[PDB]
Structures are given as structure tokens and as C-alpha cells.
């Protein structure tokens, strides 16, 4: 790390004193998913740049704003845009907001992201509930929890086998049924790698063989820090593109189309998330 416990406190107290909102839920909006803040009522926005100690969103499709508001009668705070290791941020910076949210009184964290589909049965536009994850950078020691442990947040060796709340994923499926959607709510394992380049065909095949259903360059570190500090976690990936799996294909992954997919699914995702508020 690099932040002191007081640093998180300072930031939390700053927010608590600049808004009347008191969120119980925090939502992290991934690439092209900033539209999830659109239906919040009594909304109050803070650019990340005005919040002490907050990193900056430099990726297109990430507004870089913290939006407090009410969603379906639930007080929430949304990260309209997030941070990634490939931007040059160590995980202790990428996940700074998560601990701030805990110090604000938040109890649940909803993580979302745009991801490449590895499961051949996935189609662009699909919503995949994250049932589990594979932390590749963690295998190497790249972890937000690396270094002295802050007992005021959590224990030295947190368990991750139950990271994605079982109860919330049951409600997610029940709720999806109420939406009367054409496609079924997908569910699977999200694997995180560093980026920023998109994967090669050989890497794609290997990742699928590891048992991964979707691939991305975010989320996992946020989930680890969330669980460490006691937050209930729920999340999903919007399958924005199908990773190229063969050498005969003329396709090629690109951020522009990833952002387009997010816009086309934004509406359906908003309703789903809003409906879910009632479940929390």
C-alpha cells in the first residue's frame, strides 16, 4: 500500500461533510456503463479530481465522477468510471475507493465491467453474473493486500472462496426472470489479467482452458479489498465482444466496439441493477 488508515478516514469524512447522502450500497461502473447513474434521484456528483486522495480515470468510457443518489428507494454511491493497473496504478490506488466506501458506512458493493467472452455460448450483449474469479496478477504477488495488514479493515489471510454472495446471485436470477428478457442471465468465472493489449489467440484458448468464462483487466482487486473489509459483494460482466479464438478469423478486439456494446445494453442493465436494489 501507500495510504495510511487516516488517509481513507480523511477522504470519507470529506465526503460525509459535503453531501447529505448516506449510501448503503456502492456500484462501480465499468467501460461504457456510466449510464447506470442516469436514474438516480437527489443525485450529487463529485469529479474524482475534487476528492482528496482519489486517483483519476484516464480511460475513454470512464467519466471519472462519484455520484451519490437514490436508486429504487436505496441510497447508493456510484463510481462513474474506475481505475486500472494498466493506467499505471498499483492496486492499492485502484482500490482506494472501496475502503473509503466502507468508512462511509457502505455495506454492499456491486461491481460491473465490460468483458471479453471466452465461453463459446456467450453472445455480445449477454449479462454474466460473476460467480467466481481467477486472479492472475495475484498469482505473482500483485495484490492490493500486499504489505503490512491493517487490522482495522480486515484479517491477514482473508478467504476468497465465498467472495460473490450466494444469496444475491439467487435474487439476481429471480429478478432477471421478472424482466422477461430474451436471453437468459449467464453466470460464470471472470479471469483478470493486466492489459492493456487485447489477448492473442493462444492466450484466449489457454484462459478458457483455465475454466474462465469471461476476461477483463479490472474488478478482481476491488472484490478482494471489499471482502477483506467486510463488504458483501455482487457483480456482473457485460459481454461486449467475443474474444478471437482462431487464426482464420478476421475479427479484432477494439475498445470502440466495446463502448458501443455498453451503450446498447446500458438500458437493460440499468433496469436490472435498479430492480436489484430492492433485493439489497
Ligand X SMILES: O=c1[nH]cnc2c([C@@H]3N[C@H](CO)[C@@H](O)[C@H]3O)c[nH]c12
- Minimum distance between the CB of residue 230 and ligand X, rounded to whole angstroms? 26
- Minimum distance between the CB of residue 44 and Mg ion, rounded to whole angstroms? 4
Q: For residue 227, give the C-alpha cell.
A: 471482502
Member of 112, 218, 229, 280 binding ligand X (CB under 6 A):
218
Binding of Mg ion by 271 (CB under 5 A): no
Please check if 84 is assigned to a binding site.
yes
- Minimum distance between the CB of residue 251 and ligand X, rounded to whole angstroms? 11
Member of 31, 95, 143, 175 binding ligand X (CB under 6 A):
31
**CA neighbor of 77 nearest in space, from 103, 106, 56:** 106
Helix ranges (H only) for the chain are 5-18, 91-94, 96-104, 136-139, 166-178, 201-209, 220-228, 255-277
Q: Reply yes or no on whether 56 is catalytic.
A: no
Write the DSSP symbol of residue 280: -
**CA neighbor of 128 nearest in space, from 241, 249, 250, 244:** 241
Member of 111, 134, 215, 231 binding ligand X (CB under 6 A):
215
Member of 24, 44, 45, 58 binding Mg ion (CB under 5 A):
44
Spell out, one character per residue from 80 to 119, where the chain touches ligand X: x when CB under 6 A holds, - when not: ----x----------------------------xxxx---
Give the three-class secondary structure for 233: strand
- Minimum distance between the CB of residue 20 and Mg ion, rounded to whole angstroms? 7
Q: For residue 1, give the C-alpha cell.
A: 500500500
Residue 218 interacting partner from ligand X, Mg ion, none (CB closer than 5 to 8 Å by kind): ligand X
Q: Reply yes or no on whether 217 is catalytic.
A: yes
Choice among 87, 143, 212, 226 that is catalytic: 87
The answer to whether the CB of 194 falls within 8 A of the CB of 219 is: no
Q: At what angle do helices 5-18 and 96-104 cross, to 10 degrees?
A: 60
Choice among 1, 57, 62, 135 that is catalytic: 62
Q: Reply yes or no on whether 3 is catalytic.
A: no
Please check if 86 is assigned to a binding site.
yes
Listing DSSP states for 74-129 in one string gives: EEEEEEES---GGGT--HHHHTHHHHHHHHHT--EEEEEEEEEE-STT--TT-EEE
Looking up cell 470512464 gives 62
Query: What backbone torsions phi and psi does residue 195 show, to the nearest 5 degrees?
Result: 75, -170
- Minimum distance between the CB of residue 13 and ligand X, rounded to whole angstroms? 31
Give the residue numbers annotated as catalytic, written as ranges. Answer: 31, 62, 84, 86-87, 114, 217-218, 241, 255
**Using CB under 6 A as the criterion, which residues of the chain lie in contact with ligand X when the complex forms?**
31, 84, 113-116, 195, 198-199, 215-218, 240-241, 243, 253, 255, 258
Instruction: Return binding residues for a purine D-ribonucleoside.
Output: 86, 199, 217, 241, 255
Amino acid at each position: 500500500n501507500g495510504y495510511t488508515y487516516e488517509d481513507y478516514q480523511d477522504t470519507a469524512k470529506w465526503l460525509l461533510s459535503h453531501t447529505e447522502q448516506r449510501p448503503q450500497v456502492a456500484v462501480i461502473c465499468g467501460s461504457g456503463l456510466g449510464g447506470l447513474v442516469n436514474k438516480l434521484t437527489q443525485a450529487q456528483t463529485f469529479d474524482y479530481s475534487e476528492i482528496p486522495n482519489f486517483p483519476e480515470s484516464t480511460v475513454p468510457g470512464h467519466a471519472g465522477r462519484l455520484v451519490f443518489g437514490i436508486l429504487n428507494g436505496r441510497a447508493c454511491v456510484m463510481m462513474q468510471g474506475r481505475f486500472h493497473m494498466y493506467e499505471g496504478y498499483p492496486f492499492w490506488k485502484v482500490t482506494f475507493p472501496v475502503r473509503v466506501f466502507r468508512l462511509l458506512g457502505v455495506e454492499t458493493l456491486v461491481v460491473t465491467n465490460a468483458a471479453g467472452g471466452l465461453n463459446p455460448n456467450f453472445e455480445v450483449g449477454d449479462i454474466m453474473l460473476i460467480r467466481d474469479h481467477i486472479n492472475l496478477p495475484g498469482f505473482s504477488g500483485e495484490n492490493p493486500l500486499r504489505g503490512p495488514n491493517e487490522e482495522r479493515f480486515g484479517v491477514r489471510f482473508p478467504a476468497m472462496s465465498d467472495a460473490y454472495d450466494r444469496d444475491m446471485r439467487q435474487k439476481a436470477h429471480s429478478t432477471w426472470k421478472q424482466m422477461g428478457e430474451q436471453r437468459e442471465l449467464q453466470e460464470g468465472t471472470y479471469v483478470m489479467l493486466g492489459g492493456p493489449n487485447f489477448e492473442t489467440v493462444a492466450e484466449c484458448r489457454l484462459l478458457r482452458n483455465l475454466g474462465a468464462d469471461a476476461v477483463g483487466m479490472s474488478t478482481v482487486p476491488e472484490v478482494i479489498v471489499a471482502r477483506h473489509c467486510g463488504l458483501r459483494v455482487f457483480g456482473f460482466s457485460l459481454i461486449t465482444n467475443k474474444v478471437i479464438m482462431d487464426y482464420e478469423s478476421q475479427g479484432k478486439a477494439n475498445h470502440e466496439e466495446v463502448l458501443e456494446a455498453g451503450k446498447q445494453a446500458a438500458q437493460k442493465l440499468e433496469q436490472f441493477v435498479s430492480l436489484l436494489m430492492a433485493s439489497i
